[PDB]
Amino acid sequence: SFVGLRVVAKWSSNGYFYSGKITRDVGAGKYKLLFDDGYECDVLGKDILLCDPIPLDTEVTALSEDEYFSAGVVKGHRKESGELYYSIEKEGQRKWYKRMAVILSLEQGNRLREQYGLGP
Numbered sequence: 001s002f003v004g005l006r007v008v009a010k011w012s013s014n015g016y017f018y019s020g021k022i023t024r025d026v027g028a029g030k031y032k033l034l035f036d037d038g039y040e041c042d043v044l045g046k047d048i049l050l051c052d053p054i055p056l057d058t059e060v061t062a063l064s065e066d067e068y069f070s071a072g073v074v075k076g077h078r079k080e081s082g083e084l085y086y087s088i089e090k091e092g093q094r095k096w097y098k099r100m101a102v103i104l105s106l107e108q109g110n111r112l113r114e115q116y117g118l119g120p
């Protein structure tokens, strides 16, 4: 019933949460995730945020094309040809970022667990 849903889920290697989809309930409190960057991983429910999109006014981390990142705040959403863009405000200035360029630090993801988390 969670299969096919979009999530933002913790990748254990760096502790950031990345965009992906639940592809399977694999039991033992874990789901098979397909991350948008092509990584298939089994992830604990407690590490999966069922938010699609990440809400307005959330503090997030956004990547540029050259892999530079910094914190910002979600100030908008836009759908184009089935794809989602986020308007992220950094130092008072906004740019549009594709879904998979918006990630959460461990602290930023932790903040959404109570409302959007799976498992416990």
Ligand SMILES: CCN1CCN(C(=O)c2ccc(Cn3nc(C)cc3C)cc2)CC1
Pocket: 011, 013, 014, 016, 018, 035, 037, 039, 069
């Ligand atoms: C979801 C799976 N996918 C898998 C591919 N990814 C990476 O190989 C990856 C690993 C480390 C970094 C560097 N970084 N960036 C931040 C921020 C924090 C840290 C330590 C960057 C990228 C990204 C994640």
